[PDB]
């Protein structure tokens, strides 16, 4: 429940699942504040990558607090 | 303030100032001399 | 994306001396005295003065700042009266015995008898608004904090006034700034509602929880630590809760289970003080803050991600509904009246939700014990909610008359709903008549069966019983909820569904409310009156464009008396007169609702408590077999409980008697405006102008009678004022006599 | 620094505009030195109000007051502070020095011009650029005496103006006549982590200030001949990288010096000497643990000086890559 590689592992796994989700189904992605490159994932941009990382954290708190009591 | 003298002399503000002055002198006369059913 | 024009309107006082300049027909000259009433009837009709959608919107924005100054100076007056002329520290020394009072009366004509002995030697008028329990829930200790809060409120009142002048005469925004409705929606979601909920969650964590914890322990006044001393010394906060020694660090690693000792899910009530748990409400406001700020990022403004609502409304179209919501995004961002109708509908239903939730889950300490506070807060929020719902029915009709352009919304939901107005209203009045017979004729039937001496043929519980099985099953599910369908909850959502009797200071806070056949009949009475008011307002909305009686109703305006005596007679046909009828029907609906509330709570809920467990109520359980009769509603409720308003002279509850009779006077005075028509009074006033012309004192302002809409408006205003003043005086004097 | 003559810099990269102007270059760099002098004086007065004499200095989180208790300013016997006011005079001077350095910060960007080549008097001999090696050697040459001056100011403080606090005898030791041999300085490279010697601390500081004053007279009088120019570069971000990698090394060895030493960082004020741990990152974890979730000042100083010098090493990589012939190169 504290800092561990297990909770960080399921956090990073569901986070990059959320990045793949945002790269698959966001209607308009690129037109925001431009990212310096496309090395991370896709062609997102600053606001778009902040959004899909925040959804990675929302999904992260979801499965982590859904498994910390189960 | 050539318009403030006209706004303070409209009908609601003048009738409210007159009723405030009338209620003021009535309440003051009823404090210093209360309970006068007759003369 | 900010678009501001600079100095649109010059600041000048010369326009204040010329009343009626905003409208074209009023600035010519007061040739007639009806101009005076028109000066108040069009003073806020900003859509009739300007017709460009940009001047009216900034006029609305500055009017919002002015009204916000009015609310801030009202709230400043509440905190100042609680600071200077109250007994808040005296009530905090002894909350159970003495009674709060935040208004002292100047003895001038004998009204010093209104300053009754509220307990502790302090005289004054006992307040029923119950904001003392709000202050104890927030964490106020002495009168100086209330005084500085009143000072800061007056500072923000002058700040809002300066912002109104700045946003109308210095830097006023453009129309595109107002039409940015997605940015407005997500800022109001996150930065206003969610950020304000997070602020109050932080105040409930730091101030409201430790102060109420040590006040529930029994610490006297002038011994509580100051609220900033818990932040300045976290050891005083860590000795009350063990989780505060863990710091911020478990919150960020999602180790929230160690925060369980001070963010609980207890529910129910606090048995020591008779209110909600402050840890429960702190966890509650934090959860609302998280959910609102999450929902505060849904709408795209500048960064690509987000839902623009236009294709949301495009995507919802079915087989029954034609083209769906195609056009509503262009409606609701170009017409302020449609936004006003939706917001008044949902704020009215919100205020009724507030009343229906602040009686079975009392959120404030020692609020459920004070019966006058509970009854007054319930009925006042019920009345504000019903008023705002009638205003929704008004501004829907104003949108139909003056803000509805039929060329833009073809075969959408608005056009399809206006296309079958008969198939809506002719079923709505059918269910009105069906509910009317089956909620009132039940009352007449067992009134007649009781009057004919046959109680076995009534609709009582011993008689033919109409058991409300659905809400009884729902109460069974709420009683069975903690442990089966809410396992981390200790108590129920409330103790009104089912559970133990909460007793605090010899009185009853909340016991389970069983629903017999009397509650069945009065709930169908409530559904009936709700349906009739939702019939008059809905057929004022739909039949505001045109009809088969008069098909030229849109060109005549929203607010016109009649089309004439032809077609049999067309008086009260406008969309305004449906609001005029719906105001009385809201009055009747809410009067029966608050009567059912007051009688059921003082017959089955309230009363004193005894140490062996038995509960004796205020009216000894009259609602079971005597709330099913109209004579039972008259004798056992309106005659028996009005004796505390009647026999209270020469005492503290003496102003309520001369407000009881005052409300009867304004009702009876309203009947003169409602029953009579204008032309009689015009034919009489012209005779008084003759009697003035005989003495050369006839005024050059032409004196003539009120308009027909004005006569109906003053009739419904004095009717609602007189009835609400009568119910206010009765409810306050009764519930202050019973404790 | 590459490409055309003038490149459009946005507001998120706007400090790359005054790099060649040399008039506003002094204005930002003494506004920065005013901010460190502001943090020198205000945050040792911030910690006077949050000071507990009965409680121990380690668990409270006191940072700057152990730094003055190391120099023997107001420490008494047993490891406690007998007077607060000598910590208040030094913080008052650093705040006044923050005012006058902040005063001249707006002088070199409001009244003084954008360069120093328009002047005619003594100020005409102060303009510099990123090309002339003899113009950057006179700037660097006058700096090397001031770094050597702090060693002799340390000597005059230690010999004749106050003692030092240690852990071998745990008292203020007004020492004098240090060691006079340089051979043990070659041997201290392998056990500098535990010096265990007070007379050699001031004895090595005089033995390094004589070297720092040697580099001062050398760098002023002669210019670079050319043996350094053929191996190095002379540009804007070039000379930035020589320093920013060097100060990263200084923060590296100071983050190591905090966690393991006992004499220069006394354990009666900073806390017990830490143990080097590596999980995901190398962090100097505490040996004993606190009752609450707090850490000692030795745990805060050693961890922050390592995390931030690591970013200052990788920021040296950001400037050394751009000072050489390398673009962003987002290919494939
Ligand atoms: C026909 C109308 C009428 C008349 C002739 C009077 C006459 C009087 N009233 Mg009165 N009153 C009236 C209507 C009237 N009232 C109404 C409608 C109210 C309710 C607002 C009152 C409320 C009132 C109070 C509260 C008091 C009087 C008092 C008085 C007496 C003294 C007044 C004064 O200032 O000296 C006087 C006999 C005073 C008194 O003491 O009476 C003896 C006094 O204290 N009146
Ligand atoms: C996240 C930032 C934010 C916040 C906190 C608010 C807050 C508010 N806005 Mg607002 N607004 C915002 C962004 C924001 N807005 C943006 C970006 C736009 C343009 C798209 C608008 C456009 C807008 C309009 C057109 C109107 C408001 C109004 C209001 C007030 C609503 C009710 C009220 O008075 O509450 C009570 C007051 C408070 C809770 C005080 C909180 C604010 C303090 C001073 C900070 C409230 C103060 C309405 C108004 O004028 O009300 C007076 C109104 O008509 N807003
Ligand atoms: C807007 C709301 C708000 C504000 C201003 C604060 C402010 C503060 N909280 Mg805090 N807190 C909040 C909401 C808020 N909290 C909520 C919603 C929770 C529940 C998750 C907490 C739980 C919390 C804990 C557990 C602790 C603080 C502490 C603190 C203080 C330390 C400063 C800091 O960086 O943190 C600070 C006064 C710390 C403290 O006690 O310092 C006085 C501390 O240990 N807070
Ligand atoms: C968010 C709230 C809100 C807002 C902004 C508006 C705004 C508006 N309404 Mg409105 N309305 C509302 C709620 C609201 N309403 C509600 C809740 C109802 C149901 C009661 C109505 C019913 C209503 C009607 C029936 C009409 C409007 C009209 C109007 C427009 C012109 C206002 C005007 O001329 O009145 C100016 C202000 C006054 C005339 C003052 C009214 C004074 C009242 C009657 C007495 C108050 C009694 C007081 C509380 C008791 C103490 C007094 C005394 C005993 C001391 C304006 C756009 C009119 C319109 O659009 O016509 C084209 C119109 O005919 N409204
Ligand atoms: C106490 C007086 C009174 C009564 C009884 C009614 C009754 C009614 N009003 Mg109403 N109304 C009133 C005052 C009253 N109003 C006032 C003061 C206003 C002013 C604002 C309005 C404004 C108003 C509007 C605006 C509307 C109504 C409507 C209605 C009808 C709703 C249907 C219903 O309840 O089922 C019928 C219930 C009854 C008739 C009462 C029950 C009485 C018993 C059960 C019937 C008698 C039994 C039997 C026939 C006796 C036989 C004896 C034999 C010799 C004949 C209903 C007839 C609505 C309507 O007609 O459409 C649905 C409508 O839209 N009213
Ligand atoms: C003393 C050392 C030093 C100096 C003089 C400079 C100087 C410069 N750098 Mg730089 N840099 C440094 C260290 C330094 N850097 C380090 C250590 C890193 C690694 C992190 C970087 C990474 C870096 C990048 C990635 C870029 C620069 C750029 C630049 C140039 C433009 C100024 C700028 O960044 O925009 C003005 C300054 C800002 C906008 C400030 C940014 C602050 C952000 C918004 C918040 C970051 C967190 C913040 C520090 C708060 C955290 C507090 C912490 C205690 C937790 C300028 C010549 C830019 C450049 O040359 O353009 C091509 C550029 O893109 N630098
Ligand atoms: C230690 C902090 C610090 C200091 C001392 C300075 C100092 C300076 N900045 Mg600066 N800056 C800083 C942080 C700082 N900045 C940060 C964090 C950002 C990012 C928001 C910027 C973004 C910035 C821009 C965009 C510009 C400056 C400019 C300037 C110069 C001012 C020239 C003028 O008045 O116009 C001056 C040397 C200006 C400049 O050099 O133009 C001559 C300029 O255009 N700065
Ligand atoms: C040649 C490089 C060099 C090295 C290896 C050191 C190393 C040291 N210095 Mg130091 N110092 C240097 C140059 C150097 N200094 C220069 C050039 C100056 C003048 C600005 C100083 C001024 C200075 C002071 C004023 C103090 C130190 C102190 C210290 C010791 C603990 C601080 C630390 O963690 O340092 C890494 C440490 C042995 C402290 C100490 O222990 O002395 C009592 C102390 O108080 N130094
Ligand atoms: C209840 C049935 C239900 O809610 O259906 C609602 C149904 C909705 O129609 P559609 O399925 O076409 O709706 C798609 C909508 O989502 C688009 O607005 O409309 C009606 O049948 C109107 C009659 C309501 C009155 C029903 C009697
Ligand atoms: C009496 C009556 C009139 C006559 C109405 C009149 C003469 C209005 C009377 C107004 C007088 C001047 C009283 C002033 C109103 C308030 C008391 C003003 C407040 C002033 C204080 C604050 C000082 C109508 O015009 C009418 C029209 C349609 C249906 C019914 C009726 C109706 O019943
Ligand atoms: S009675 Fe009055 S409102 Fe009715 S039709 Fe005749 S004039 Fe119009």
From Swiss-Prot, chain A:
It comes from the Bacteria. GO terms for cellular component: photosystem I; plasma membrane-derived thylakoid membrane. GO terms for biological process: photosynthesis. It is a multi-pass membrane protein. The gene is psaK1. Belongs to the PsaG/PsaK family. This is Photosystem I reaction center subunit PsaK 1. The chain holds residues 14 to 83 of 86 of the full protein. Keywords: Membrane, Photosynthesis, Photosystem I, Thylakoid, Transmembrane, Transmembrane helix. The chain crosses the membrane at residues 1-21, 48-68. The keyword Transmembrane applies. The keyword Glycoprotein does not apply. It is found in: Cellular thylakoid membrane.
Curated annotation (Swiss-Prot), chain B:
Pfam families: PSI_PsaJ. InterPro entries: PSI_PsaJ, PSI_PsaJ_sf. Keywords: Membrane, Photosynthesis, Photosystem I, Thylakoid, Transmembrane, Transmembrane helix. Disulfide bonds: none annotated. Its main location: membrane. The chain crosses the membrane at residues 7-27. GO terms for cellular component: photosystem I; plasma membrane-derived thylakoid membrane. The keyword Isomerase does not apply. The keyword tRNA processing does not apply. It is found in: Cellular thylakoid membrane. It is a single-pass membrane protein. SUPFAM superfamilies: Subunit IX of photosystem I reaction centre, PsaJ (SSF81544). One of its GO terms (biological process) is photosynthesis. PANTHER family: PHOTOSYSTEM I REACTION CENTER SUBUNIT IX, PTHR36082. Belongs to the PsaJ family. May help in the organization of the PsaE and PsaF subunits. This is Photosystem I reaction center subunit IX. It comes from Synechocystis sp. (strain ATCC 27184 / PCC 6803 / Kazusa).
Swiss-Prot record, chain C:
Phylloquinone binds at residue 681. Keywords: 4Fe-4S, Chlorophyll, Chromophore, Electron transport, Iron, Iron-sulfur, Magnesium, Membrane, Metal-binding, Oxidoreductase, Photosynthesis, Photosystem I, Thylakoid, Transmembrane, Transmembrane helix, Transport. GO terms for cellular component: photosystem I; plasma membrane; plasma membrane-derived thylakoid membrane. GO terms for biological process: photosynthesis. PSI electron transfer chain: 5 chlorophyll a, 1 chlorophyll a', 2 phylloquinones and 3 4Fe-4S clusters. PSI core antenna: 90 chlorophyll a, 22 carotenoids, 3 phospholipids and 1 galactolipid. P700 is a chlorophyll a/chlorophyll a' dimer, A0 is one or more chlorophyll a, A1 is one or both phylloquinones and FX is a shared 4Fe-4S iron-sulfur center. It is found in: Cellular thylakoid membrane. It catalyses: reduced [plastocyanin] + hnu + oxidized [2Fe-2S]-[ferredoxin] = oxidized [plastocyanin] + reduced [2Fe-2S]-[ferredoxin]. InterPro entries: PSI_PsaA (IPR006243), PSI_PsaA/B (IPR001280), PSI_PsaA/B_CS (IPR020586), PSI_PsaA/B_sf (IPR036408). Chlorophyll a' binds at residue 664. The chain crosses the membrane at residues 60-83, 146-169, 185-209, 281-299, 336-359, 375-401, 423-445, 520-538, 578-599, 653-675, 713-733. GO terms for molecular function: 4 iron, 4 sulfur cluster binding; chlorophyll binding; electron transfer activity; magnesium ion binding; oxidoreductase activity. [4Fe-4S] cluster binds at residues 562, 571. It holds the Pfam family PsaA_PsaB. Chlorophyll a binds at residues 672, 680. Its EC number is 1.97.1.12. It is a multi-pass membrane protein. Belongs to the PsaA/PsaB family.
Swiss-Prot record, chain D:
GO terms for cellular component: photosystem I; plasma membrane; plasma membrane-derived thylakoid membrane. Pfam families: PSII. The chain crosses the membrane at residues 23-43, 87-107, 136-156, 206-226, 238-258, 301-321. GO terms for biological process: cellular response to iron ion starvation; photosynthetic electron transport chain. It is a multi-pass membrane protein. Induction: By iron stress, salt stress and to a lesser extent by heat shock. Its main location: membrane. Binds 16 chlorophyll a molecules per subunit. It is found in: Cellular thylakoid membrane. NCBIfam families: PS_antenn_a_b. Belongs to the PsbB/PsbC family. IsiA/Pcb subfamily. Functions as an antenna for photosystem I (PSI) under iron-limiting conditions, when phycobilisomes disappear. In the (PSI)3(Isi3)18 complex most of the harvested energy is probably used by PSI; in other PSI-containing supercomplexes a large part of the energy will probably not be used for light harvesting, but rather is dissipated to protect the organism from light damage. This is Iron stress-induced chlorophyll-binding protein.
């Amino acid at each position: 429940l504290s800092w561990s590689p297990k909770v960080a592992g399921v956090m990073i796994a569901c986070n990059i699942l959320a990045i793949a989700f945002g790269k698959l189904t966001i209607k308009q992605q690129n037109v925001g504040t431009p990212m310096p490159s496309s090395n991370f994932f896709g062609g997102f941009g600053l606001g778009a990558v902040l959004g899909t990382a925040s959804f990675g954290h929302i999904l992260g708190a979801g499965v982590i607090l859904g498994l910390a009591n189960m | 303030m050539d318009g403030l003298k006209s706004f303070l002399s409209t009908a609601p503000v003048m009738i409210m100032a007159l009723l405030t002055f009338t209620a003021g002198i009535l309440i003051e006369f009823n404090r210093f001399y209360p309970d006068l059913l007759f003369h | 994306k900010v678009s501001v024009d600079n100095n649109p309107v010059p600041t000048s006082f010369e326009k204040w001396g010329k009343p009626g300049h905003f409208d074209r027909t009023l600035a010519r000259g007061p040739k007639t005295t009806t101009w005076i009433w028109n000066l108040h009837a069009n003073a806020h009709d900003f859509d009739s003065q300007t017709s460009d959608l940009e001047d009216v919107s900034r006029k609305i924005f500055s009017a919002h700042f002015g009204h916000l100054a009015v609310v801030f100076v009202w709230l400043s007056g509440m905190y100042f009266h609680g600071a200077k002329f109250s007994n808040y520290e005296g009530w905090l020394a002894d909350p159970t015995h003495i009674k709060p009072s935040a208004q002292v009366v100047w003895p001038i004509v004998g009204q010093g008898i209104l300053n009754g002995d509220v307990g502790g030697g302090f005289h004054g008028i006992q307040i029923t608004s119950g904001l003392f329990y709000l202050w104890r829930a927030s964490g106020f200790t002495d009168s100086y904090q209330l005084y500085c809060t009143a000072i800061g409120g007056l500072v923000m009142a002058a700040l809002m006034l300066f912002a109104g002048w700045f946003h109308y005469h210095v830097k006023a925004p453009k129309l595109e700034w107002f039409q940015n409705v997605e940015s407005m929606m997500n800022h109001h979601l996150a930065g206003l509602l969610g950020l304000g909920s997070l602020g109050w969650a932080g105040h409930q964590i730091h101030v409201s929880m430790p102060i109420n914890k040590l006040l529930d322990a029994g610490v006297a006044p002038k011994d509580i630590p100051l609220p900033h001393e818990f932040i300045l010394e976290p050891s005083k906060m860590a000795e009350l809760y063990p989780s505060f020694a863990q710091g911020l660090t478990p919150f960020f690693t999602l180790n929230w289970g160690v925060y369980s000792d001070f963010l609980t899910f207890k529910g129910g009530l606090n048995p020591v003080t008779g209110g909600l748990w402050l840890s429960d409400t702190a966890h509650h406001h934090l959860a609302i803050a998280v959910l609102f700020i999450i929902a505060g990022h849904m709408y795209r403004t500048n960064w690509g991600i987000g839902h623009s609502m236009k294709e949301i409304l495009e995507a919802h179209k079915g087989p029954f509904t034609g083209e769906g919501h195609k056009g509503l995004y262009e409606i609701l961002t170009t017409s302020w009246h449609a936004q006003l109708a939706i917001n008044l509908a949902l704020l009215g239903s919100l205020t009724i939700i507030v009343a229906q939730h602040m009686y079975a889950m009392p959120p404030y300490p020692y609020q459920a014990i004070d019966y006058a506070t509970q009854l007054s807060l319930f009925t006042h929020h019920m009345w504000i909610g019903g008023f705002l719902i009638v205003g929704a029915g008004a501004h829907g009709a104003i949108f139909m008359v003056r803000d509805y352009d039929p060329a833009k919304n073809v075969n959408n939901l608005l056009d399809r709903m206006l296309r079958h107005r008969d198939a809506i209203i002719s079923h709505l009045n059918w269910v009105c008549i069906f509910l009317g017979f089956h909620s009132f004729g039940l009352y007449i039937h067992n009134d007649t069966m009781r009057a004919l001496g046959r109680p076995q043929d009534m609709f009582s519980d011993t008689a033919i019983q109409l058991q409300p099985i659905f809400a009884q099953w729902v109460q069974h599910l709420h009683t069975l909820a903690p442990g089966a369908t809410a396992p981390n909850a200790l108590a129920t959502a409330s103790y009104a569904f089912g559970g133990e009797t909460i007793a605090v200071a010899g009185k009853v806070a909340m016991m389970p409310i069983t629903l017999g056949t009397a509650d069945f009949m009065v709930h169908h009475i409530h559904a009936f009156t709700i349906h009739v008011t939702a019939l008059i307002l809905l057929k004022g909305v739909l039949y505001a464009r045109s009809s088969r009686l008069v098909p030229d109703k849109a060109n005549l305006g929203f607010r016109f008396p009649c089309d004439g005596p032809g077609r049999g007679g067309t008086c009260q046909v406008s969309g305004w007169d449906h609001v005029f009828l719906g105001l009385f029907w809201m009055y009747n609906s809410l009067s029966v609702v608050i009567f059912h509330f007051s009688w059921k709570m003082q017959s089955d809920v309230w009363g004193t408590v005894s140490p062996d467990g038995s509960v004796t109520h205020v009216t000894l359980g009259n609602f079971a077999q005597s709330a099913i009769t109209i004579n039972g509603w008259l004798r056992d409720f309106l005659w028996a409980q009005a004796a505390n308003v009647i026999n209270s002279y020469g005492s503290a509850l003496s102003a309520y008697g001369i407000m009881f009779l005052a409300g009867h006077f304004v009702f009876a005075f309203s009947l003169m405006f409602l029953f009579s028509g204008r032309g009689y009074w015009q034919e009489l006033i012209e005779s008084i102008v003759w009697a003035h012309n005989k003495l050369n004192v006839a005024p050059a302002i032409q004196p003539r009678a009120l308009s027909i809409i004005q006569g109906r408006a003053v009739g419904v205003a004095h009717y609602l004022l007189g009835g609400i003043v009568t119910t206010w005086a009765f409810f306050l004097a009764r519930s202050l006599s019973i404790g | 620094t590459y490409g055309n003559d003038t490149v459009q810099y946005e507001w998120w990269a706007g400090n790359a505009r005054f790099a060649d102007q040399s008039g506003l270059f002094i204005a930002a760099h003494v506004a920065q030195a005013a901010l460190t002098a502001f943090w020198a004086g205000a945050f040792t007065l911030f910690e006077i109000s949050r000071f507990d004499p009965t409680q121990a200095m380690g668990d409270q989180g006191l940072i700057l007051l152990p730094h003055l208790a190391t120099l023997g300013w107001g420490v008494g016997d047993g490891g406690q502070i007998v007077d607060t006011y000598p910590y208040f005079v030094i913080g008052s001077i650093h705040l006044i020095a923050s005012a006058v350095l902040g005063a001249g910060a707006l002088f070199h960007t409001l009244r003084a011009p954008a360069d120093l080549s328009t002047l005619k008097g003594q100020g005409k001999k102060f303009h510099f650029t990123w090309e002339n090696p003899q113009q950057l050697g006179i700037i660097l040459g006058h700096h090397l005496l001031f770094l050597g001056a702090g060693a002799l100011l340390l000597a005059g403080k230690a010999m004749y103006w106050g003692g030092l606090y240690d852990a071998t005898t745990q008292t203020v030791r007004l020492v004098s006549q240090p060691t006079l041999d340089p051979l043990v300085i070659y041997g201290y490279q392998t056990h500098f982590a535990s010096i265990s010697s007070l007379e050699d601390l001031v004895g090595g500081h005089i033995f390094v200030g004589f070297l720092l004053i040697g580099g001062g007279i050398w760098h002023i009088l002669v210019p670079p001949l050319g043996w350094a120019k053929k191996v190095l570069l002379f540009s804007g971000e070039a000379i930035l990288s020589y320093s920013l990698g060097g100060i990263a090394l200084a923060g590296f060895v100071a983050a190591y010096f905090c966690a393991v030493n006992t004499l220069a960082y006394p354990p009666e004020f900073y806390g017990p000497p830490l143990a080097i741990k590596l999980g995901i990152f190398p962090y100097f974890a505490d040996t004993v643990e606190l009752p609450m979730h707090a850490h000692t000042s030795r745990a805060w100083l050693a961890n922050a000086h390592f995390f931030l010098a690591f970013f200052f090493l990788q920021g040296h990589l950001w400037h050394a890559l751009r000072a050489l012939g390398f673009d962003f190169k987002r290919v494939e």
